[PDB]
């Protein structure tokens, strides 16, 4: 049986546009293609807007006691109560999201040390097995 | 020694269905997949370096080059227009062209 469902309160991840790699919460299902994401604008900056399902991805978290057409006030309370931001950052996608930001601030000298250091560490790990 | 260039493919000249304008040559720089990544390369040097099997009795170089400049984007898939000192030979279609890093603007 499928685990992740497009439901009300399902936490979704934006994959393209100005808010790429930003969390969102579904609070309405217009049809099979369009949903209304209201990932709290005061928390993640995602405005209340209608997006196509081809632009977002599902996650393993659902915010409890979220009804369709929830106001930004009550929805913000349920979002922080569930500690969604805390749990998301420990997931494989969350560690991959912070990695993209982290490696994007490297300079030429930064890439020099990593390439030299890891190449020495990787070679040593090969020696350790006989 | 080191690699200080990005290979670009000489796809062909600027053309239409039944015409051809060899003044401008189209290039596909490696790693540029959209026209928004082109602003960096507009103005960078481009060299078509080829090898000629000269004879030991001559003094002409065995490695000659034609240089040019990337001038403008061409389409939405990161294709560029390059104008060289001499028009590229059509025999060099699909070969690799070095896209240098100068004139630098950083």
């Amino acid at each position: 049986v499928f685990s992740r469902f497009v439901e009300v309160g399902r936490v979704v991840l934006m994959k393209t546009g100005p808010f790429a790699s930003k969390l969102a919460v579904i609070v309405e299902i217009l049809d099979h293609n369009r949903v209304l994401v209201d990932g709290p604008q005061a928390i993640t900056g995602v405005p209340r807007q209608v997006v196509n399902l081809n632009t977002i991805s599902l996650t393993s978290f659902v915010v409890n006691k979220v009804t369709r057409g929830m106001t930004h006030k009550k929805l913000c309370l349920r979002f922080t109560q569930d500690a969604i931001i805390k749990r998301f950052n420990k997931t494989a996608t969350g560690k991959a999201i912070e990695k993209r930001i982290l490696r994007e601030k490297m300079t030429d000298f930064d890439k020099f040390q990593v390439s030299i250091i890891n190449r020495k560490i990787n070679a040593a790990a090969k020696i350790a097995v006989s | 020694k080191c690699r200080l260039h990005v290979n670009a493919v000489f796809m062909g000249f600027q053309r239409a269905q039944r015409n051809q304008y060899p003044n401008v040559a189209l290039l596909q720089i490696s790693g540029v997949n959209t026209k928004e990544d082109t602003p960096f390369y507009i103005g960078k040097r481009v060299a078509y370096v080829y090898k000629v099997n000269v004879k030991k009795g001559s003094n002409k170089p065995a490695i000659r080059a034609i240089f040019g400049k990337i001038v403008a984007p061409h389409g939405n898939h990161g294709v560029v227009k390059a104008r060289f000192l001499h028009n590229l030979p059509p025999k060099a279609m699909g070969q690799n062209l070095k896209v240098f890093l100068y004139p630098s603007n950083i």
Partner: protein
């Protein structure tokens, strides 16, 4: 697609200069809105632009383009046989947004181009007045479905390589 509020009056022998003709016209721009407005007057009240003055042609915007509403567009279109009156239900957040859906649905299901459809009125219906069989399945509060066979999403055209290394997989998504 934009909505306009247009008013005018007729100043000649036949019409007294104290009757104001209001309208709410959905047009791509404001020049088309007046063009639609004038033909409505010419075919219904014998009023022509040469004997009339426009008063106010102002755009109309959605008060709450964040609330999902169920619409009900009453319209008449022309087919090969004759003329028919149709009623269609749509779910959208803006009045102009739903009208574009109606135009795209009419031009696909009925193959009717835009210069055959006249929009009589558009209202908002409740959560139980929806009669479209497909659209009636998405009005409930307890609606859920696993969106499956997703194509993996590309962040932007920047990373869209023509040839990829390794196997390609879909997503339970």
């Amino acid at each position: 697609m934009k909505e306009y509020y247009i008013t005018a009056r007729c100043t000649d022998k036949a019409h007294n200069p104290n009757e104001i003709f209001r309208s709410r016209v959905f047009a791509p721009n404001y020049v088309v809105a007046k063009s639609k407005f004038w033909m409505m007057l010419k075919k219904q009240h014998k009023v022509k632009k040469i004997n009339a003055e426009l008063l106010q042609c102002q755009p109309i915007f959605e008060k709450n383009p964040t609330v999902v509403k169920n619409y009900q567009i009453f319209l008449r279109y022309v087919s090969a046989g004759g003329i028919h009156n149709i009623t269609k239900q749509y779910r959208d957040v803006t009045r102009v947004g739903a009208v574009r859906q109606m135009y795209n649905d009419l031009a696909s299901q009925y193959r009717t181009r835009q210069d055959k459809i006249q929009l009589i009125s558009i209202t908002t219906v409740g959560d139980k007045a929806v009669k479209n069989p497909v659209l009636h399945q998405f009005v409930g509060h307890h609606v859920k479905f696993p969106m499956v066979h997703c194509k993996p999403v590309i962040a932007s055209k920047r990373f869209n390589l023509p040839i990829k290394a390794g196997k390609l997989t879909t997503k339970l998504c």
